[PDB]
Amino acid sequence: SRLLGFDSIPAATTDTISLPKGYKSSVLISWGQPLHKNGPAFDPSGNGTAAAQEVQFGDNNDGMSLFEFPGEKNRALMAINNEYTNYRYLYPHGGMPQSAEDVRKALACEGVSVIEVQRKNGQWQFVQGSRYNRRIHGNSPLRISGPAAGHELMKTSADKHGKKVLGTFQNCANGKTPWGTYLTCEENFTDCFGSSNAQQQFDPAQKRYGVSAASREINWHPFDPRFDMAKNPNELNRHGWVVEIDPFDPQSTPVKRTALGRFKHENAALAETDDGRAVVYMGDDERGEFIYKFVSRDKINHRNAKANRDILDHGTLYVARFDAGDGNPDHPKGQGQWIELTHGKNGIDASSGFADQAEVLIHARLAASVVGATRMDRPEWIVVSPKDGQVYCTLTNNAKRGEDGQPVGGPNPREKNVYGQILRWRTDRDDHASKTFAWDLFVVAGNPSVHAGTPKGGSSNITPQNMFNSPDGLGFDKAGRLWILTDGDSSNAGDFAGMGNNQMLCADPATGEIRRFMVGPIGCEVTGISFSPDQKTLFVGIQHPGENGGSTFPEHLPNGKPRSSVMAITREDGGIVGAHH
Numbered sequence: 306s307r308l309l310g311f312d313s314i315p316a317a318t319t320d321t322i323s324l325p326k327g328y329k330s331s332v333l334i335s336w337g338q339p340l341h342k343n344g345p346a347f348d349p350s351g352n353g354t355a356a357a358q359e360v361q362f363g364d365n366n367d368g369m370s371l372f373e374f375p376g377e378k379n380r381a382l383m384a385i386n387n388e389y390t391n392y393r394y395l396y397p398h399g400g401m402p403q404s405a406e407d408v409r410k411a412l413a414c415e416g417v418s419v420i421e422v423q424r425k426n427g428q429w430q431f432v433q434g435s436r437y438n439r440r441i442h443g444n445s446p447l448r449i450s451g452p453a454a455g456h457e458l459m460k461t462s463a464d465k466h467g468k469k470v471l472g473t474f475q476n477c478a479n480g481k482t483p484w485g486t487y488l489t490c491e492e493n494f495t496d497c498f499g500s501s502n503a504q505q506q507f508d509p510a511q512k513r514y515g516v517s518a519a520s521r522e523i524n525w526h527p528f529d530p531r532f533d534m535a536k537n538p539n540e541l542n543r544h545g546w547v548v549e550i551d552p553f554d555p556q557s558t559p560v561k562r563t564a565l566g567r568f569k570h571e572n573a574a575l576a577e578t579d580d581g582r583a584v585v586y587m588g589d590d591e592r593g594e595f596i597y598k599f600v601s602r603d604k605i606n607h608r609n610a611k612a613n614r615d616i617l618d619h620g621t622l623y624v625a626r627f628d629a630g631d632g633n634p635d636h637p638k639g640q641g642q643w644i645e646l647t648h649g650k651n652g653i654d655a656s657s658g659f660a661d662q663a664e665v666l667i668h669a670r671l672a673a674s675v676v677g678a679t680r681m682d683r684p685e686w687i688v689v690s691p692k693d694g695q696v697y698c699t700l701t702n703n704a705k706r707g708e709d710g711q712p713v714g715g716p717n718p719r720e721k722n723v724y725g726q727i728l729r730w731r732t733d734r735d736d737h738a739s740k741t742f743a744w745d746l747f748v749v750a751g752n753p754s755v756h757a758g759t760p761k762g763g764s765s766n767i768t769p770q771n772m773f774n775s776p777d778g779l780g781f782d783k784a785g786r787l788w789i790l791t792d793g794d795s796s797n798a799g800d801f802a803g804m805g806n807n808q809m810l811c812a813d814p815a816t817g818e819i820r821r822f823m824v825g826p827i828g829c830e831v832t833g834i835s836f837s838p839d840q841k842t843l844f845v846g847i848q849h850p851g852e853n854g855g856s857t858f859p860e861h862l863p864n865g866k867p868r869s870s871v872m873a874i875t876r877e878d879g880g881i882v883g884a885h886h
């Protein structure tokens with residue numbers, strides 16, 4: 306490979322970061338770090354307050370982007386998602402929230418952390434006390450824009466006009482726009498809602514989005530009625546959006562961009578049509594849900610960033626259908642298409658339950674079913690090659706593939722899929738405006754040690770040396786290396802014998818070759834990726850280390866508390882990460 310400059314490292318099970326020879330890692334920032342001058346220190350006992358957590362780096366850091374600081378080669382901003390929190394570590398009692406203050410403290414953990422980093426003696430470090438440092442959390446005041454802003458379904462007792470919402474939370478992954486803004490994606494937002502009525506009736510749209518009376522072991526609703534569907538059912542509609550943040554304006558109000566649709570958003574992959582309009586590819590991470598694409602009405606104004614204020618409020622949302630492909634077991638290839646989600650088109654109208662375009666967007670999942678989108682094996686991150694524009698999407702796994710309604714075929718080639726696969730497409734004419742594409746499975750993950758010579762052994766670019774499961778995050782670097790991050794089963798047993806802890810790998814898009822680059826600590830997943838502009842630092846997240854009680858990473862104090870961290874990975878010889886020595 307021209308691209309892969311390091312030797313594939315062994316799988317590992319240690320409570321450490323493992324890297325190739327000549328590489329090193331440092332903690333950039335961890336959950337609980339105060340952001341502001343004289344801010345409250347992290348308290349490992351759990352006794353930190355909600356108010357303190359609102360001014361500290363959030364928990365479970367996830368997707369992130371780095372923004373070059375105009376005029377300053379040795380400064381940058383990073384916007385980093387904080388997806389959820391770990392009650393065993395958050396509270397001294399280690400259990401469910403017990404009060405309104407406990408619920409406020411959990412909401413404080415989630416959202417986005419904007420931080421400044423500065424380079425000193427070659428190394429990037431967090432700058433506490435920067436005027437740019439900011440928490441946006443689950444109680445922050447946000448705006449709603451786009452076609453669904455002000456709709457009846459978006460109004461609540463607290464917000465009678467449907468344009469002002471408290472919080473972004475369950476922030477999974479990210480996008481970075483060419484007009485200098487950050488997109489954060491609300492994914493498992495429904496988990497946070499419940500009802501004081503255990504026998505709560507839910508309507509078909511509520512059921513399709515997966516709300517329950519119990520909540521998903523979040524249990525905010527007993528103390529914060531905003532999350533109690535018996536009282537505030539339309540609050541469910543005011544989350545599940547892509548939210549746009551200006552990291553360079555620390556007093557700006559972030560905006561929920563309803564034109565991009567409501568669903569369990571993983572990330573938001575930016576591209577541009579040949580005629581200059583913005584394109585955002587988006588996955589909905591749930592078994593049997595869909596892949597989407599938004600194309601703006603307006604051209605991006607590259608020279609005048611602020612002129613793009615409303616660009617994500619106008620345009621067209623599409624959803625994918627994939628054909629059956631050619632059935633090749635190692636490397637299936639086919640065609641697919643984008644289908645418009647527009648009131649009055651493709652059978653989307655009052656007769657199929659949509660009064661207007663706002664409802665199409667609020668209930669995008671339902672609209673996409675009407676038009677016959679292809680049910681997918683848990684779409685997670687999407688990236689677009691900077692070299693050739695080809696688009697890659699992880700399909701992390703789907704244990705229910707093969708069940709009635711989720712047939713095996715095309716880009717979902719295995720029943721009871723525990724390993725996942727990476728889907729690629731090439732938009733027609735290499736124009737992201739096109740409504741058709743060619744697709745192929747770039748890799749089918751598997752375990753060829755345990756399941757040699759069967760579909761569970763994976764595709765031929767998987768070997769016993771490099772094998773992994775449940776690819777999730779993705780990132781390209783400027784050279785065109787594809788970085789693959791995992792959130793899989795870390796048992797190192799059974800179907801996963803030999804795979805070890807979660808990990809990051811690097812792939813050559815042209816050749817299909819994959820090499821293991823990093824292994825993370827016990828109980829984590831590896832998520833979030835950004836590069837310095839010079840490509841000599843790779844920033845990567847280690848999320849929920851010790852989720853089941855087996856880690857003290859990164860500090861390794863005796864009987865210590867593990868902390869989600871952003872790591873900085875560099876070469877000892879100062880060269881470009883991933884490249885030859």
Ligand SMILES: [Ca+2]
Binds near residue numbers: 477571685777778832
């Ligand atoms: Ca993920």
Ligand SMILES: [Ca+2]
Binds near residue numbers: 701777792
């Ligand atoms: Ca995942």
Ligand SMILES: [Cl-]
Binds near residue numbers: 627628642
């Ligand atoms: Cl198709």
Ligand SMILES: [Li+]
Binds near residue numbers: 367368
């Ligand atoms: Li994530």
Ligand SMILES: [Li+]
Binds near residue numbers: 792830
């Ligand atoms: Li996970």
Ligand code: NA
Binds near residue numbers: 838
């Ligand atoms: Na740089």
Ligand code: NA
Binds near residue numbers: 827828851854856
């Ligand atoms: Na653990």
